[PDB]
């Protein structure tokens, strides 16, 4: 029996309706699947569309029988072409409390100033100082990962934490929102090197060619979010041919 009631329901939409209907998005069509238990599982993003919490609430189901009615339900009341509210045209399905906290913690950055160093970095010392540059060379600095996936891989090994800063090479145009700004310190060797250090990125130009040395100071959280969005787009595009 269940093989039949797993076979006639695939492709037959059902209208879910919240009993205290308030707005237009209180009734929505969905593609049901058979779950084990006695409760209806609902997507969290559409919950604010239903204004539904989970302290105990009831949802009524309806089945469209007519072929025209099924076409209406599938092609007009699905929560992928009703993503905007009709009030002013603002998103109705946005990451709410828990997802919002996750994304905020992901994109929170490192510790900027005195919260990352106990003593001032002016501190003329630790130069490995002598008359020549032939001394101990540790220079822990920050990792110099090739690209995103190298950074994620190095994060998986627990080599670095989520908010530990790192340098990432950039092979694109300028994306990070900057402003009038100012380069803090641009070093210039006697030979053309154009060592520029901005607030959050470093540019090594020259006097001949190949201005490709763009390096970004970042953390693995921002890389993870950008990779998530980018691969979601490039996967939806190729999945849908």
């Amino acid at each position: 029996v269940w093989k039949i009631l797993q076979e006639v329901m695939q492709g037959h939409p059902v209208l879910l309706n919240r009993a205290p209907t308030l707005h237009r998005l209180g009734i929505q069509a969905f593609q049901p699947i058979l779950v084990e238990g006695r409760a209806i599982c609902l997507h969290p993003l559409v919950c604010k569309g239903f204004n539904a919490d989970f302290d105990g609430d009831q949802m009524a189901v309806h089945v469209p029988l007519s072929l025209e009615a099924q076409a209406e339900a599938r092609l007009l009341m699905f929560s992928h072409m009703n993503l905007l509210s009709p009030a002013i045209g603002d998103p109705i399905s946005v990451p709410t409390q828990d997802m919002l906290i996750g994304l905020y913690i992901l994109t929170s950055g490192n510790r900027r100033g005195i919260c990352a160093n106990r003593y001032n970095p002016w501190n003329h010392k630790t130069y490995q100082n002598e008359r020549i540059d032939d001394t101990n060379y540790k220079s822990m600095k920050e990792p110099f990962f090739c690209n995103f996936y190298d950074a994620i891989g190095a994060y998986r090994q627990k080599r670095i934490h989520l908010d530990s800063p790192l340098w990432l090479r950039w092979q694109l145009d300028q994306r990070i929102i900057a402003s009038k700004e100012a380069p803090i310190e641009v070093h210039y060797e006697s030979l053309g090197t154009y060592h520029e250090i901005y607030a959050h990125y470093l540019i090594i130009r020259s006097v001949k060619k190949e201005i490709i040395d763009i390096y970004i100071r970042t953390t693995v959280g921002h890389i993870s979010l950008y990779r998530e969005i980018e691969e979601a787009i490039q996967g939806f595009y190729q999945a849908c041919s």
């Binding site: 007009l76 009030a87 002013i88 045209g89 603002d90």
Partner: protein
């Protein structure tokens, strides 16, 4: 003159009422951090101010005085006829503007059912089934979407 003059006056009064009402409605929502586009306000406001009331001493033969014909209804015929049209204005409320509807079925299912049905039956009113509530009442298909 009289034909030009009150066409001008009624049009001015309706315009000023609309401008005042839109801002008065929107201020309450903007003072509480509520964002709604002006389309939804204006759609209701137009129905609030769209009908004139034929004032007294405007008998003629087409518009009996006391009638509540529409704004276009009056301003198109005033440009053609020459009697004492003599309407003034109505800023009908959200309740009264729905009782003076083109379909008696919709009004009868809103308020004052007995009075609406009695008046419609005595007059012999005809509903042409152009709205959405009347077609739902009869079980027929609504003419939307």
């Amino acid at each position: 003159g009289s034909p030009w003059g009150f066409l001008i006056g009624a049009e001015l009064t309706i315009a000023q009422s609309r401008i005042s009402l839109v801002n008065k409605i929107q201020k309450v929502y903007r003072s509480q951090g509520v964002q709604i586009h002006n389309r939804h306000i204006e759609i209701i406001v137009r129905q609030i101010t769209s009908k004139v009331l034929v004032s007294e001493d405007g008998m003629s033969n087409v518009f009996l005085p006391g009638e509540l014909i529409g704004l276009f209804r009056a301003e198109r015929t005033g440009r053609a006829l020459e009697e004492a049209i003599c309407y003034r204005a109505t800023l009908l409320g959200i309740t009264r503007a729905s009782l003076n509807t083109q379909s008696f079925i919709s009004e009868a299912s809103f308020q004052e059912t007995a009075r609406v049905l009695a008046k419609a039956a005595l007059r012999g009113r005809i509903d042409w089934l152009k709205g959405l509530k009347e077609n739902v009442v009869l079980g027929g298909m609504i003419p939307v979407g």
